[model samples]
Target: GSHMLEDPVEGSESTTPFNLFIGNLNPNKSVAELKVAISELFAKNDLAVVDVRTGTNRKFGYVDFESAEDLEKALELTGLKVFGNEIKLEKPKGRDGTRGC
Candidate 1:
């Protein structure tokens, strides 16, 4: 994937509504494997993750939460080390409003 860092996401200050993108991943790891690791990490911080999804190349994946509070909390752990790799955390790149409907 030709992932590029874009501008800050657009959204109301009322709450966050985006999934967390995890980059610099370890392709050797499976989705279910990463899910358990990620879930535990957040849980250690008193946050519960709602879901997890892996990238096609297994080089990246997403971490989701039921609420913005949890997402924002996870954001603070951008540089966290997961299973031997330091992953990058950012808002998922969205194509909303950029397509010609």
Candidate 2:
């Protein structure tokens, strides 16, 4: 049997919000570690994290936040020398010349 999909009848719209990336992370850190670090710095509800990749376990990685406000808070606290070394945060430039991960 073949399935038939119906298109939108009319007046249907959709929107997808962008996520902010916290780049220049220490690669040795895991997703959980990043989340905890950010949480300690700002309100946890406004933040989210996604692991970009891993290298020698101490190189670099990426994390995504739910909103810009949270991103700002992260930037404010990242390089404070809390965990022996400072973590750098920035809005990564995107392919279309926009800011993103």
Q: What TM-score should be assigned to candidate 1?
A: 0.65
- My TM-score estimates for the predictions, one after another, are 0.65, 0.43
lDDT of 1 by residue, 1-101 (tens): 53545557864321224466776666776655766777888889887687667766767777767675886777777756667666677665552322334
Name model 1 segments beyond 4 Å from true. 1-18, 93-101
Best by lDDT: 1
lDDT of each: 0.66, 0.44
- lDDT for 71 in candidate 2 is 52
User: Mind sharing the TM-score for model 2?
Assistant: 0.43
**Model 2, residue pairs in steric clash:** 28-57
- Superposed by TM-score, candidate 2 places the C-alpha of residue 48 at a distance from the truth, in angstroms, of 5.3
Q: Candidate 2, residues 1-101: lDDT per residue as tens digits?
A: 32436475642121112233444444555644644565554444444432223223544444554445645555665554323346555455441213345
Cα lDDT for residue 11, candidate 1 = 49
